[PDB]
């Protein structure tokens, strides 16, 4: 529930950035926020896994 809740919180924050970037209309700005979100979520998994271990 902890990792799950946090992953959700992170996704929400990431989503916020993507949405904000999309508002500008710049495809490149959205891409940057998206790559960041994807890499961030992957790192978050690393953190969560490391913690459990």
């Amino acid at each position: 529930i902890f990792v799950g809740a946090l992953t959700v919180l992170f996704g929400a924050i990431a989503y916020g950035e993507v949405t904000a970037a999309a508002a500008t209309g710049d495809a490149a700005a959205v891409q940057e926020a998206a790559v960041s979100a994807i890499l961030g979520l992957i790192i978050l998994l690393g953190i969560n896994l490391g913690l459990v271990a």
């Binding site: 946090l6 992170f10 924050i13 950035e17 960041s36 979100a37 790192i43 978050l44 953190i47």
Partner: protein, 220 residues
């Protein structure tokens, strides 16, 4: 949303600081230093987060944003975490001096590299990465052997805190490389959020694990 994230970090560190201070209120003459160290670890971090939440220490370096308080925090708090681990392991002055030296090189390296525009920042990163591997060696080798001379409870706590430390600390360099300091693939917001999470776990999580073992150690 950066300031909001910094405030959350400050609040989290504050809660930890107070919990550790309260938990050590009646600590014996032999546990005292441990509780005090924990208070200092999370207390200094709380100050760094408050300073950043107030918009102080933000450094717009070559098209990126690095946060000076973050690195200052690390330079001062990570050696206290190593000190705590060293106390459990039962190190002497010389041994403490070795790990603190290695730890300091790591933190100074990341700080300098973060403030350095251009490929030179990677040489600085390398210096910190190598020092870190050296630190990990001492933690898992010599210091673990030293910890093995203590009670089963102490050795057990040392190992748990050491694992948490080695595993999570190893993640910071990847965030440095992927975040604003390095290739900047992570936005400042995502970078800050991941660090808030890692900082809370490596300091406050670290502390609660120690607090949880306190009663067992006294019983020994």
């Amino acid at each position: 949303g950066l300031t909001t994230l910094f405030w959350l970090g400050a609040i989290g560190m504050l809660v930890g600081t107070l919990a550790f201070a309260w938990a050590g209120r009646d600590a014996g003459s032999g546990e005292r230093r441990y509780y005090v160290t924990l208070v200092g670890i999370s207390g200094i971090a709380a100050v760094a987060y408050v300073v950043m939440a107030l918009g102080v220490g933000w450094v717009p370096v070559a098209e990126r944003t690095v946060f000076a308080p973050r690195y200052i925090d690390w330079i001062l708090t990570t050696p206290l975490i190593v000190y705590f681990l060293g106390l459990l392991a039962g190190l002497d002055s010389r041994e403490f001096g070795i790990v603190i030296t290695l730890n300091t090189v790591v933190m100074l390296a990341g700080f300098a590299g973060a403030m350095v525009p251009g490929i030179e920042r990677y040489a600085l990163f390398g210096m910190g990465a190598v020092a870190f591997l050296g630190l990990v060696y001492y933690l898992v080798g010599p210091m673990t052997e030293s910890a093995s001379q203590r009670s089963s409870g102490i050795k057990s706590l040392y190992v748990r805190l050491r694992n948490l430390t080695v595993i999570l600390w190893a993640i910071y360099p990847f965030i440095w490389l992927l975040g604003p300091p390095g290739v900047a693939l992570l936005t400042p917001t995502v970078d800050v959020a991941l660090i808030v999470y890692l900082d809370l776990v490596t300091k406050v999580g670290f502390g609660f694990i120690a607090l949880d073992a306190a009663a067992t150690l006294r019983a020994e």
